Amino acid sequence: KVTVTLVDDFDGSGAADETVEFGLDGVTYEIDLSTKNATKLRGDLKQWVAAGRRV
Amino acid sequence: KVTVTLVDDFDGSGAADETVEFGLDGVTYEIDLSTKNATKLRGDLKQWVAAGRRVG
């Protein structure tokens, strides 16, 4: 049978739960992640977003 | 005398050497940083940029 799977781009393992959008140096990215991993990515950006300012 | 200086936003006690643009969840951000802290920022996103896909 044909199986279509949404795979977590970061640890390569499982049913990814969400796609997160993010950016650096004017480049925009998208990434498919488990709930756990998207929490991890937002966690890594937390301190820079706080110190930074919205444009 | 008056002094005008770019101060590192992250720790607040240093001359910023550069301004870095980044984004999360549709929102775009700017931050002024020392060369060192700019390296830390880019370092924190490195694994995520690597696994992610560039879009418009």
Author numbering:
A (entry chain A): 4 to 58
B (entry chain B): 4 to 59
Describing publication, verbatim:
Lsr2 is a DNA-binding protein that likely influences the organization of bacterial chromatin and gene regulation by binding to AT-rich segments of DNA. The Lsr2 dimerization domain forms a compact homodimeric α/β structure. The dimer forms a 4-stranded anti-parallel β-sheet such that the helices are arranged in an antiparallel fashion and are on the same side of the β-sheet.
We then artificially induced this proteolytic processing by adding low concentrations of trypsin to purified N-Lsr2 before crystallization. This facilitated crystallization in a different space group, P3121. The dimerization and the linear oligomerization of N-Lsr2 is identical in this hexagonal space group when compared to the structure in the P21 crystals. This provides further evidence that the tendency to form linear chains of dimers by processing of the N-terminus is intrinsic and not a crystallographic artifact. The hexagonal crystals have a higher solvent content (70.0%) when compared to the monoclinic crystals (38.7%) and there are pores running through the crystal lattice. Intriguingly, these pores are of appropriate dimensions to accommodate long chains of double stranded DNA beneath the N-Lsr2 molecules as well as the Lsr2 C-terminal DNA-binding domains adjacent to the N-Lsr2 molecules.
